[PDB]
């Protein structure tokens, strides 16, 4: 239907795009496909799609959605990524309400691990929201949609006022040049609140009303929320960006250290502070694909027919 992909159904939408589930014809695996029509796109929008792709190519992490292939025709651009079977966290909150702090701590640990790794590779998401935090088949977080993402240098100020309004930091609304990671830490605070409360800390009927709420920095802490969790959120949702917790301080918070000892979380946050599958290559050789050409597509970050098949087969 579209290259080596037979399209199943529309699973979501995006800026001038439609996301559709599809099946790889040679590997029978499921993928997500963003179909962008280039006819409704301008020079600035096309550059914002190239940057999104170039950022997704730099990020290989267990809690980040993996880009497999990029296909481009004279009128269309298709982005093929791994399929998050469980869908958005937002839809899971609509179905079951607020998450228990034990269950929320597990997901939040996964969410910060991915965001820490992004900041590690000098990248800021800038669009963290419940509808962008997807779940795999085992209900584990997979961060997605790097449309607003950008590269940063520590100590620099960004000038792109983008993000999901309910999760956007106050400085974004004010049009102030900001520090990238601090904007993501505000978003993470909102994410943690919506996970444990099943509602937003700042909400309104219109964007004008939402903005007024975000700029006030005042929000209700419900009775069910622990004093340890309240402390963490109150130290992330701080109007002055400099008085917000750092990603390292968030990881070592009393709420984060609560419950059972998690050495797997520690060995993943330490990895951010920094083989070839010959069996797959033999199977690809049988399908009529050259071993040296497969290696050359992997070496060059082409994200072509050979890149996608190796990646899909490694599951």
């Amino acid at each position, epitope marked *: 239907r579209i290259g080596y992909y037979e399209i199943d159904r529309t699973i979501g939408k995006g800026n001038f795009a439609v996301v559709k589930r599809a099946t790889h014809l040679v590997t029978k695996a499921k993928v997500a496909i963003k179909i962008i029509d280039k006819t409704q796109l301008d020079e600035e929008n096309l550059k914002k799609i190239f940057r999104e792709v170039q950022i997704m190519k730099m990020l290989s992490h267990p809690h980040i959605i993996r880009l497999y292939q990029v296909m481009e025709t004279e009128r269309m651009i298709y982005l093929v990524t791994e399929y998050a079977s469980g869908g958005e966290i937002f839809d899971h909150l609509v179905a079951h309400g607020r998450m228990a702090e034990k269950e929320a701590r597990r997901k939040f640990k996964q969410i910060v691990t991915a965001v820490y790794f992004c900041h590690s590779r000098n990248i800021v998401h800038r669009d963290l929201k419940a509808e962008n935090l997807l779940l795999d088949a085992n209900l584990n977080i997979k961060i997605a949609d790097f449309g607003f993402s950008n590269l940063f240098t520590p100590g620099q100020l960004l000038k792109t006022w983008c993000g999901s309004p309910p999760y956007a930091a106050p400085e974004l609304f004010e049009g102030k040049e900001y520090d990238g990671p601090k904007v993501d830490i505000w978003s993470l605070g909102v994410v943690l609140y919506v996970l444990v409360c099943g*509602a*937003l800390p700042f909400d309104g009927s*219109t964007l004008q009303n939402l903005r007024a709420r975000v700029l006030s920095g005042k929000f209700r802490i419900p009775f069910f929320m622990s004093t340890e969790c309240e402390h963490l959120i109150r130290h992330m949702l701080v109007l002055d960006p400099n008085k917000r917790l750092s990603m390292e301080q968030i990881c070592k918070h009393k709420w984060m250290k609560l419950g059972d000892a998690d050495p797997n979380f520690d060995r993943l946050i330490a990895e951010s502070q920094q083989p070839l599958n010959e069996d797959v290559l033999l199977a690809m050789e049988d399908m009529g694909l050259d071993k040296e050409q497969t290696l050359q597509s992997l070496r060059s970050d082409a994200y072509d027919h050979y890149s996608a098949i190796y990646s899909l087969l490694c599951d």
Partner: single-chain antibody
Framework: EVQLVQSGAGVKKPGSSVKVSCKSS????????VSWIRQAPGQGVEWMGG????????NYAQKFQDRLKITADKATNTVYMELSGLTFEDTAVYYC?????????????????????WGRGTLVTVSSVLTQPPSASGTPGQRVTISCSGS????????VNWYQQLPGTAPKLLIY???QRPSGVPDRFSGSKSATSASLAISGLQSEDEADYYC????????????FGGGTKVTVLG
């Protein structure tokens, strides 16, 4: 054709939690904006929560945030409401109501928060802002007027809606968006809004109009909520 079917009545012991269902059966099935509104015996109607913005999963009224959980099964078109830590004050009729203009919401459009469709109500019993006159009266043929005073954050900023409630029935939309009348409402009923106050006028009063009348508006205070009036018992005199 489209109707909200609620779960049956029940008795809960104090401390326990109660779950109420609201299945959308008939006609235009798809996506809706169901809210949960309660009414204690002989008391006014009160908004508890529901979907009221394009931004978040659910919005709860400050009073109910601590004990309410509002969920939805999109697959079966059923919307749920779970109220925990029940007390004798929670004995009431729980209604589910759909926001009429959901299909226009886009973050810029300001919704009217008028309740299009309502469920029959679920009676849950525990055992072991807007100023409206309490009552109004008039002889047949007269024009009776009900006032509804508010603040800048509610009537001053949002549209006013009026509901008529006959005995043993859920409230029914009478006036929406300050002056508009849904199909079925006669020309005798008319609304008006001025600064932070609204008014309902029942011209050519009939015996069939003896009912409770509630006034409502969106309030932009806190994360937003729909506020209701105390209610007015209109009595048709001899």
């Amino acid at each position: 054709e489209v109707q909200l079917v609620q779960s049956g009545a029940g008795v809960k012991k104090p401390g326990s939690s109660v779950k109420v269902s609201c299945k959308s059966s008939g006609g235009t099935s798809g996506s809706s904006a169901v809210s949960w509104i309660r009414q204690a015996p002989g008391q006014g109607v009160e908004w508890m929560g529901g979907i009221t913005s394009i931004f978040g999963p659910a919005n709860y009224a400050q009073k109910f945030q601590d004990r309410l959980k509002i969920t939805a099964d999109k697959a079966t078109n059923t919307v749920y409401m779970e109220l925990s830590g029940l007390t004798f004050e929670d004995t009431a009729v729980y209604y589910c109501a759909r926001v009429g203009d959901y299909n226009f919401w886009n973050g810029h459009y300001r919704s009217g928060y008028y309740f299009d469709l309502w469920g029959r109500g679920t009676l849950v019993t525990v055992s072991s802002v807007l100023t409206q006159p309490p009552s109004a009266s008039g002889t047949p043929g007269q024009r009776v007027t009900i006032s509804c005073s508010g603040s800048s954050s509610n009537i001053g900023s949002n549209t006013v809606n009026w509901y008529q409630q006959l005995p043993g029935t859920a409230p029914k939309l009478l006036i929406y968006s300050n002056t508009q009348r849904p199909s079925g409402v006669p020309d005798r009923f008319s609304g008006s809004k001025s600064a932070t106050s609204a008014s309902l006028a029942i011209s050519g009063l009939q015996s069939e109009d003896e009912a409770d009348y509630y006034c409502a508006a969106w309030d932009d205070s806190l994360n937003g909520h729909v506020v209701f009036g105390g209610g007015t018992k209109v009595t048709v005199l001899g």
